[PDB]
Design a protein around this ligand. Sequence first.
Ligand SMILES: *[C@@H](CO)[C@@H](O)[C@H](O)[C@H](O)COP(=O)(O)O
Ligand SMILES: *[C@@H](CO)[C@@H](O)[C@H](O)[C@H](O)COP(=O)(O)O
Ligand SMILES: *[C@@H](CO)[C@@H](O)[C@H](O)[C@H](O)COP(=O)(O)O
Ligand SMILES: *[C@@H](CO)[C@@H](O)[C@H](O)[C@H](O)COP(=O)(O)O
Ligand SMILES: *[C@@H](CO)[C@@H](O)[C@H](O)[C@H](O)COP(=O)(O)O
Ligand SMILES: *[C@@H](CO)[C@@H](O)[C@H](O)[C@H](O)COP(=O)(O)O
Ligand SMILES: *[C@@H](CO)[C@@H](O)[C@H](O)[C@H](O)COP(=O)(O)O
Ligand SMILES: *[C@@H](CO)[C@@H](O)[C@H](O)[C@H](O)COP(=O)(O)O
Lengths: 223, 223, 223, 223, 223, 223, 223, 223
Amino acid sequence: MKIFLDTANIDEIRTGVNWGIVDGVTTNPTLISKEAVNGKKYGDIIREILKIVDGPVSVEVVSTKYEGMVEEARKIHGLGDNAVVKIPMTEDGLRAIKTLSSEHINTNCTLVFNPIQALLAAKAGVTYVSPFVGRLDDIGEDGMQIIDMIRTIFNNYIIKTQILVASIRNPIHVLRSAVIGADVVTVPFNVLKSLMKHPKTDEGLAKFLEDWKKVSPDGKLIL
Amino acid sequence: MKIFLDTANIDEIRTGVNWGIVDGVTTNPTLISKEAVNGKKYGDIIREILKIVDGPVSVEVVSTKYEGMVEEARKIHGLGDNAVVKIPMTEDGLRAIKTLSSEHINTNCTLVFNPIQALLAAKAGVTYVSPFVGRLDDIGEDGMQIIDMIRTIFNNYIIKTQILVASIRNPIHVLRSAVIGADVVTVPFNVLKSLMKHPKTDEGLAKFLEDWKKVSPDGKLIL
Amino acid sequence: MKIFLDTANIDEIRTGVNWGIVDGVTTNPTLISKEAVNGKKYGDIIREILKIVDGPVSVEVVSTKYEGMVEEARKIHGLGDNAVVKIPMTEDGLRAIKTLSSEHINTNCTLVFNPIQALLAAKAGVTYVSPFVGRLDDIGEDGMQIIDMIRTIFNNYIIKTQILVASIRNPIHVLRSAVIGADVVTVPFNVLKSLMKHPKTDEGLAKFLEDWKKVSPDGKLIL
Amino acid sequence: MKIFLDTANIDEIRTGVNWGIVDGVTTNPTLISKEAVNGKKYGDIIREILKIVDGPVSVEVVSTKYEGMVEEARKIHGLGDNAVVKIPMTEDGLRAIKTLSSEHINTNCTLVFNPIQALLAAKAGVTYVSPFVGRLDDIGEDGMQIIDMIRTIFNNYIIKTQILVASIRNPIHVLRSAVIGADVVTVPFNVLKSLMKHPKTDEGLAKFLEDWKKVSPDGKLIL
Amino acid sequence: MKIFLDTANIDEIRTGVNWGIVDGVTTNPTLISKEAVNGKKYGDIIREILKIVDGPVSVEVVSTKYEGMVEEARKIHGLGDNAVVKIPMTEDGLRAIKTLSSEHINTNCTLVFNPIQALLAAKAGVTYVSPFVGRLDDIGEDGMQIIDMIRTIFNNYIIKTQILVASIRNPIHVLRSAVIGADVVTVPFNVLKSLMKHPKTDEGLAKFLEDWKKVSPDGKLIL
Amino acid sequence: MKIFLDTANIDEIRTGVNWGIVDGVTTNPTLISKEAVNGKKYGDIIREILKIVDGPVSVEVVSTKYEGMVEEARKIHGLGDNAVVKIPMTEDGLRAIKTLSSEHINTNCTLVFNPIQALLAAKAGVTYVSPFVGRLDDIGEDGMQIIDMIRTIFNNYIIKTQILVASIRNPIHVLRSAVIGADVVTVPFNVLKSLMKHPKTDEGLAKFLEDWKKVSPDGKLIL
Amino acid sequence: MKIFLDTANIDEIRTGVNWGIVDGVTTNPTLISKEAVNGKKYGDIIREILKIVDGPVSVEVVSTKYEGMVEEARKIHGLGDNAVVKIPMTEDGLRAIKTLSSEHINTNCTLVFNPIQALLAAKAGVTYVSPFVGRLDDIGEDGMQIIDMIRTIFNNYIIKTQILVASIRNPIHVLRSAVIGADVVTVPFNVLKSLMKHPKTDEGLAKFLEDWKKVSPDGKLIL
Amino acid sequence: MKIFLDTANIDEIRTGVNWGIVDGVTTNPTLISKEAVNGKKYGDIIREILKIVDGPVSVEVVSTKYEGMVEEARKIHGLGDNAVVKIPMTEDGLRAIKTLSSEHINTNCTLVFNPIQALLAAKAGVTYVSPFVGRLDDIGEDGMQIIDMIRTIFNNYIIKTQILVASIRNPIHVLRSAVIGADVVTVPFNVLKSLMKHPKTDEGLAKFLEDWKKVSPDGKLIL
Ligand SMILES: *[C@@H](CO)[C@@H](O)[C@H](O)[C@H](O)COP(=O)(O)O
Ligand SMILES: *[C@@H](CO)[C@@H](O)[C@H](O)[C@H](O)COP(=O)(O)O
Ligand SMILES: *[C@@H](CO)[C@@H](O)[C@H](O)[C@H](O)COP(=O)(O)O
Ligand SMILES: *[C@@H](CO)[C@@H](O)[C@H](O)[C@H](O)COP(=O)(O)O
Ligand SMILES: *[C@@H](CO)[C@@H](O)[C@H](O)[C@H](O)COP(=O)(O)O
Ligand SMILES: *[C@@H](CO)[C@@H](O)[C@H](O)[C@H](O)COP(=O)(O)O
Ligand SMILES: *[C@@H](CO)[C@@H](O)[C@H](O)[C@H](O)COP(=O)(O)O
Ligand SMILES: *[C@@H](CO)[C@@H](O)[C@H](O)[C@H](O)COP(=O)(O)O
C-alpha cells in the first residue's frame, strides 16, 4: 500500500518527505486555498510541492465544464511528470477523464461516495479513484464498507485503476484499508505522524536502554 | 462490467451515448412497440439505433417457431455487425441459438428466471444470457440471488456466455450485480442517469468552488 | 407487521381499504399537492382521508420552526383521534416531537436516512420513525441495511417507537422488512396490489377449477 | 410437528389413521375429483373423511367470489366441527377469511408461493397457511427457503397462524420442515409410508432375531 | 446428561455401578443372548440386572406384531418399576408405544437412524428415543449429525421424549452428545471406563504426591 | 455441466436429442426391463440407443462376479465407441474397473451412496461415478450433501473421475448439482422437460406478443 | 488419498492386496509382536510383508537412542526399496530423521499428537508424519481437529511431507480425512472392508437383478 | 515456518543447536545484559553465538539516532555474514533500515505492536519484522490477532518482508503462528524444549517397548 500525504502545507510535506515514509501527495481546492494567504500564491504552492515530492502529486482542476477541465488538466500536466490531474465525479469529468487518459495524462477521480461511481471512473480509464471515507462517516455510514466493495468489484473485473482511500481521519481507516487491500491511502499530517507510534515501543526502548547501561555505563555498543 | 441502456427511445439513447457511459443497448418487443406509434415504423427505429450505437444492440425475434426465429435472426444480423439477436428461453429458442451460434451470429437468450434456464442457454452456445431480476422482485423473490447462483455456476464450468442482468429497476440491482461479478447490466434511462450522482459529490464541489474564490475571485486556475 | 398505504389519492385509499389489507395511510406535502388540483383543496383531501381510514393517518406539518410545527400539529390532532403528526428530522422537529409527545399527540418522524437519526427521534418520544429506503437505494446505498440496524438498536434498548419503513419501491423492500421485523411498512398503491399476486396462484386456481368441473358440471359446491 | 395426509382416498386415510401417525387430512378439488369417479359422489367423500378423521380436515371452496366463498365455507363448517375451510390466496379469498375468522370458522389459506402472501393471510386471521414447496421446486426455486422465511416472519410478530407445509414430494421436505419448525406438514400417502422406514432398521431387526434364536429357538420372549 | 451402560454383562454392570457413574442400563437381544449361554438363562440375566441397577433398565421385546409386543411389554413392566420397554421403530412398534404410553408403561424406541423416525417415535409418546450413531458411522455417514438435528427438532416443539444416544463407540460420541445437549448417552463398558481418565490427571497427581513428600515424608496430611 | 437422460425409452431419447439439450444417456437393468416388453429385445434396445446418441451411453453389466463383469464389459464396449460400462460398487466391481481401465474401456461406477465409496471407485480409475441422491432422500438423508463432499474430495486430490449425479427426482437436485459443480447430471425425461420452463417466461412471451400486435397486426417481424 | 493397511497379519494383508484397494502397509512393534507367536519370527513376518506389498511398508525401529535408530533404519532399508523406517517423535528420533533423510532413506515419524510435533518432523525432512487420531479420541479430544490444522500448516509452507492419518478406528475418521485432504490413511482390516459397503448398494443390486430376470430368464447379458 | 531461539544464553543455544531443531537466534539488549555478568563481556557473547549458529543471528543496535544506528549496524554486519541487525520501530529506525537495505545488510525491525507499524517497516525494505505477541497479551489484548492481520496485509501486497513472531510465551503462540502462516517464530528455551513433548508420545513408546520384549527379550531388532 502506498501512503500519500493529504495537505498543501509545505512544511508538513517537507517534514514527511524527510521521514522517507511519504510516497506522494494529494491536494484539493480547499487545502490549497488554506495555504495561499498572506501574499502566498497558489501557483507557487503547487510548483513547490511538485519539486519537493518525487512521487505522484494530485492537483485538482477548478472548471466544471469539459473543455475547461481538459485545458486546465493539460496545464497541470505541463508543470511536471509527477503531476496527476484530479477531476471530480461528474458527467463532464468522466468525459475529461476519457480524453486525458487517451492522451496518456494520469488522472485521479475525486468526490466519489459509492462503489458504482468508482466503477464508472474506472471505465473512463482513470488512473486513481478517491472515495471519501471520512465524509461518509460524517453522515452516519461506515465509509470503509464502500472501500471493501470497490476492492471486490475491481478484483472481479481485473480493473487496473488504483483505489486511493481519501478523507482519512484516523489510523483505523488506514489499518482497515491495508487489510482490505486498497492500493493507496492519503492521510493528513496529524494521522501520518501517529502511524509510527505505540506506547509499548516507547516503553520497550526505555527498558532496553536501562538494562544495557547495567553492562555498559556509557550506553554504547563497542564491537 | 459493461453497462447497456434498456430502451428503444432514440432520444434517451442519443443522450446516454453522449454521456460516454453507454456500452450498448437492449430492446424488446414491448419497448419497440412503445416507440413505433403515430406513424413511426419499427423497421426505422431498429435501423436508427443500430446506426447510433457503436456497441452491441439486442433485437428480439417475434416468431415462436424454430424456422421463423432463424429467418428473423438472419435478417436482424444483416442490419449491422453490432446487432445481437434476442431469442426467448423456449425449446425452439434453444434450437435456434444452437444454429445461429454455428453461423457465428451473436445471440442473447431472454426471459430467463432461474439459474438452470440460464445454464441451458449457455449450453446452446448463447453469447449473452439475460435473467430478469425486477420481474422476480415483482413476484416476491429476491431476483439478485439468481444472478449470484448463475455467476457461481458459470465460474464452476468456465462458461464464456456473458451474464447480462436485465429487468433492472434501481441502482442497487446495479451495485449488487457489480459485487457479484455479472458481465453486463442493462438499465432503463432513469436508473442510468442516477448512477453518476451523489449528494456529497454536489456538496463537495460547491464547497471547493466557494473556497477557491477566496484565492481566485474570477474562479479560474491560472497555471 | 402493519401495512399502510403511501398516497393521498382517495380512489387508491378507498380501493385498498375495501380490500381489507390497509391498516393506515401516510401522506406528505408532495403526495397531497399532487392531488390538490382542478380546484381540489388540501383541507378537504386530508379530512376525507381521515374519514375513510379507521387506522393511523400521518399528515406532515409544513412549518420549519418549532412554534409553527407545534401549532400545526395541534390543529392536525384536532381533526380526529386517528391523525398522526409527521415531523421532519431537524433540531426544531426534535424539540416539537418532545413537546407533542408530552401532550399525548402521536407523531411520526420523517426524512430519516441513518440509524442514529432514528435513535434521536425515538429518544424524543416519537410514536413512529420513517427511514426512507428507496431514496438511499437511489444514491447507491442498500437502504434495507439501515432498517436492519435500527431494528437491532431498538431491540437493544427495548424502544417502543415503531419502525415505519417508507420510500418503498418494490415487494422485496416489503419482504426484507418483514424478515428483519420492522413494525410497519407504508407502500405505494402499485406495490400494495402486487403483494397478493403470484403466477403459480393463478395457474393453480385454474387447474383446480378445471378438475372440479369433471365432478360438478356447473362448477358448484353443493353440501 | 403435526403430520396430515394429503389425499382424498378413503383407504389411505383409514390406513394412516390406523397407523396412529396421522393428525388430520388436507384435500383440494383435484384430489377429490380423483376419488369422485364411477358413481362415487364428492359430497359423500367429504362427509366420510370428516367422519373417519378426528383431527382437522381441510376442504376447499370452489367459488372464486367473496359471497360464494363465504356461503360454501358456512356449509363446509356445518358438516362437522373438525372441518377447516380452504380458501385460495386472492383478494376475495382474504376478505372471506376475515369474515369467517370473525364467525369463529377455522380457515386454511392455500396456493401460497412466497412469504408475503403468507403474511397477508395471517393478517386476515387465517388458522393455517399452506405454502406449496414442491411446486416451487418444479420451477427451479428451492421451496423450503420460503418456509424458513415464513417461520422467521411469524416468529418476529408472534403470529398464531400455523404454517402447514404442502405440495410435499419427498422425505427431505419433511425433515427440513421439522428442523425449521413448521407447525404442520401435509404429505401424500406414499411419502407418509416412507417416513417410518430405514434399511438399518430392517437389518438391525433381522440380526436381533437371528441372535435371539440362539438363546430361544421359538423366537419368543418368555418372562 | 444421564450416562447409561450398554451391556447385559452382569460383572460389567456391578463394576460400573460401584464406580457411582452409571445412571441406568440398556440391553438388546444381541447383548442378552451373548450372556445367555452355557446354562445361563435370559430370564435370570434380566431379573438380576433389574435388581442390581437402581435407575432405568431397557429390555427389548422380541415379537414383531402389535399384540405380541404389548403382551411382552407388560411382562417386562411387571418385573420391576425401573424396567423400560425397548420397542423397535416399525408400524407395529409405534402402535405398541402409543398403547403402552396410555398405560403409563415407560418405553424406549430403538433402531432409529434419522431425525424423522425419531420425531414419529416422540409423536407416539415414547419416553426415550435411541438413534444409533455408530451404525451410521459404519455406513459412512457422521451419526452425530442426526443427534444434532433431533435436538433441534425436539427443542422446536418442546418435545419431552428424552434423546438417548446409542450405538456409542468412542468418547467423542459422548463429548459431542453433551455439547449438543442430548438427554442420555448409553455406552459400552470399555468406553465408560475411559471417560474419567486423562494422562495429565495421572501425571499431575504423581507430581503433587512427590512434592508433598518433601514436607511430609510419610505422605499424609495431619490437620 | 453435462446433462444426460436417465431412461431406456427410445421415444424420450430421440425427443431429447432433438431438443439439442441432451449430452448422453444412462441406462440400468430396471430401465431396460421396462422397455423390453411385448417382444422388444434388450439387445436391440441397447444397440438402438448407441446408434441414436452421439454422447456417452452407460450400459450396466449383470454378472456379479469379476470374470463375468469383465466379459460382459468387453462385449458392451464392442458395440460402439460411445458405450460406457456401468459397474456396481462391490469388491468384484472395483477389480473389474481396474482391469477395464487398463484396457482403455470407459467405466461408470454405480450404486454409490457415500463419499468414500466414490473415492474408492475413483482410485480404481473409473471414468464416472454415480451417487444416487434420490434414494438417499428416500431414507431421510439429504442426498445432495454427499455430492458436495465428493466434489470437495475430488478437488483436493485433483481427481479426474467425473461426478455423475444420479437418482435425480426434481429440478432442485439439478440446480444444487450445478452450484456444487458436479460434472454431469442424469435426469428422467419428465424432469428434463421441466428444466426449460417457467411461468414468467410464458407470461413474458404472451405479453410481448400482445404488445407487438399493436404495431404489427399479423405478428411478424419484417426486416 | 492413498489407503494403507494397519496390521502385521499376513492373511489380512494378502486379502486386502488381492482386493486391489491397499496401497501400502504400516506396522508397529505391538502389531508385529501380536503376530510373532507359535514360533513365528518377526524377521520372517517383516520380509514376507515386504514381498507381498508393492507399495510403501513402514517398519518401526525399536532403539530409543540416535545411533541405534540409524543402525536399525539402515538395516530396514536394506530389506527392500519399498521399506519405510518408522521413527518416534523424540529428540533422538528427529536427529535420526535428519540423518536418514540426507541418506535418501524414506521415513515415517510416528507417535505424533499435535500439529507442532508434526511440523517439527516435517522440518527434519521426514517422508510421512503419522498423527494418532483414535488415541486422542480416547482421551476426550476430537483427533480429526489435529489433522485439519496439520493440513493447513503444511499448505501454508508448501511442505512435501505426507500426512498419514493413523490410529484410525472407524469409517468417519476416513471420510473426514478425505474431506480435509490428508495424503494417506492407514486403517485396520475391519475398517478397510467396511469402506466398500452400504445397505442401499446391496438392496439396489438385488432389485436390478430381479428386474433383469424378467427379460433374461437365465440372468445373462448376451450381446 | 523457521524456528529461532530467543536467548543470549550460550548453554541453551548450544543445546538447541545440537537437537537440530533451531534455525537461528534472536537477542536483544535485555537478554544480552542478563548473560554479561560475573566477568562475561557482551562482545564475547555476541561473537560466540555468531560462531555456533549456522543461521541468522539477530543483534540489536543501542543507539537511538540515525547515524549511530547505521554505524553500529555496520559493525554488527562485519562480525559475520549470518548477522542480522535489529533496529527499533522509530523514525530514525525506518531511516536506518532504508539505508542498510540499500547496503545489502539484513535487518529486523523490532518493538512492533500493531500491523501498520509492521507495514511501515516492510515499506522501508526490512528483511524481517518482529511483532511482540506476549507483550500485547500482558496488556490484555490477544497478540496473535496482530499476526493474523499482518499476514493478510503482507499477502495482499506480495510483501517479501518475513513475519518473525516474537515475545513468544507458550506453545499455543507457536501453534497459532503456524496456522496463520507466519514465516518465523523465535522462542525462549523453556518453550522450545516443550514443543517436542506430549504425554501420549511417552505412553506410546513405553507400550511399544513392553510389547517388543515379548518377541525379543533383549529388546533388539535383528535384521
Ligand atoms: C483528494 C482525493 O485524493 C484529496 O485531497 C481529498 O479531497 C481529501 O482527502 C478530502 O478530505 P476531507 O474530507 O478532509 O476534505
Ligand atoms: C432484453 C434482455 O436483455 C431486455 O430488454 C429485457 O426484455 C428487459 O430488461 C425486461 O425488463 P422489464 O421487466 O422491465 O420489462
Ligand atoms: C411519510 C413517512 O412515513 C411518507 O409519506 C414518506 O414521505 C414517503 O414514503 C416517501 O417516499 P418517496 O421516497 O417515494 O417520496
Ligand atoms: C392443501 C393445502 O393444505 C393441499 O391439498 C395442497 O393443495 C396440496 O398439498 C398441493 O400439492 P400438489 O402440488 O401435489 O397439488
Ligand atoms: C438399545 C437402545 O438404547 C441399545 O442397547 C442399542 O441396541 C445399542 O446401543 C446398539 O449398539 P450397537 O450398534 O453397538 O449394537
Ligand atoms: C445409472 C448411473 O448413472 C442410472 O441409470 C441410475 O441407475 C439411476 O439414475 C438410478 O435412479 P433411480 O433411483 O430412480 O433408479
Ligand atoms: C504407525 C504409524 O503410521 C501405525 O502402525 C500406528 O502405530 C497405528 O496406526 C497406531 O494405532 P493404535 O492407536 O490403534 O495403536
Ligand atoms: C527480538 C525480535 O525483535 C526478540 O529478542 C524480542 O526482543 C523478544 O522476543 C521479546 O520478548 P519479551 O517480550 O519476552 O522480551
